[PDB]
Swiss-Prot record:
Coiled coil feature spans: none
A single GO BP: T-helper 17 cell differentiation
Family: Belongs to the nuclear hormone receptor family. NR1 subfamily.
Sequence motif: AF-2, positions: 235-240
GO-annotated cellular components: chromatin; nuclear body; nucleoplasm; nucleus
Subcellular location: Nucleus
Name under which the protein is recorded: Nuclear receptor ROR-gamma
Induction: Up-regulated in the state of obesity.
Annotated keywords: Activator, Biological rhythms, Developmental protein, Disease variant, DNA-binding, Metal-binding, Nucleus, Receptor, Transcription, Transcription regulation, Zinc, Zinc-finger
Full-protein positions shown: 267 to 507 of 518
Amino acid sequence: LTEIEHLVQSVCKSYRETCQLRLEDLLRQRSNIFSREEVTGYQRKSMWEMWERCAHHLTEAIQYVVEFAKRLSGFMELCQNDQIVLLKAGAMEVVLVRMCRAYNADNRTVFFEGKYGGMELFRALGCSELISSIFDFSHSLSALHFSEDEIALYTALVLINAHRPGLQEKRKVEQLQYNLELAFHHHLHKTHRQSILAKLPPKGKLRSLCSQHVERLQIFQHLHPIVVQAAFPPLYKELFS
Ligand SMILES: O=C(O)c1ccc(/N=C/c2c(-c3c(Cl)cccc3C(F)(F)F)noc2-c2cc[nH]c2)cc1
Ligand SMILES: CC(C)CCC[C@@H](C)[C@H]1CC[C@H]2[C@@H]3CC=C4C[C@@H](O)CC[C@]4(C)[C@H]3CC[C@]12C
């Protein structure tokens, strides 16, 4: 079988082994919705407690994306500088895409600490506009009904982007990007799903939402810093130190 068919299978496998939550569990858990009393309990928590809970959930989600990246064929053969450039620019963009699997467009809820709740759950953070933008982005993606394999291949391409400023081996990243682009396009053709290509987000949209999100995380980290065991210490030290 072709190099390309093996690449499709290796990306989909890496995604399945690092997807964090199973699509089947997320879909079954949709009727499990926070009560009005439970929502008020979250809204009454301090900004610093809600920050600690959200920062830790986001850090864990990032570490699943680092492991995904480390299993992509060719990623570990890039020099360490380029691994960090791609993960710094891309890992949180991948988390914001992965969110659509945990999002219910019928009631605008996300899976958070065991149940589905609306953006009002997060009232204590004082970030309603940013959180509203994140919910709207997931709402956009949800209308594609991405397959597990589509989201594996799309998120691989979010990370493997030869236009990220600061790459030292831009040609080696182009070669991996071209192969992943061919794998995605090959797979959409094979499954009669080329129709999603015209519906994917404007590329600057993900970058611009993500830059606002990370800027806000960096401000909270500065006021009330959390600490975690780095999966990728060189990357951690770039973001945290
Ligand atoms: O090695 C590891 O395990 C590891 C774990 C997490 C890392 N960064 C996470 C963050 C955060 C963030 C979060 Cl999630 C919570 C609190 C504070 C921050 C802060 F802003 F301070 F960085 N924000 O953006 C990213 C990011 C990562 C890649 N691109 C953007 C980096 C390495
Ligand atoms: C701006 C900062 C301070 C607050 C952000 C609040 C909201 C939007 C955050 C807090 C915790 C986050 C979740 C943490 C973990 C996961 C699992 C991952 O597989 C998909 C994304 C998902 C489901 C995140 C979606 C966004 C999320 C719900």
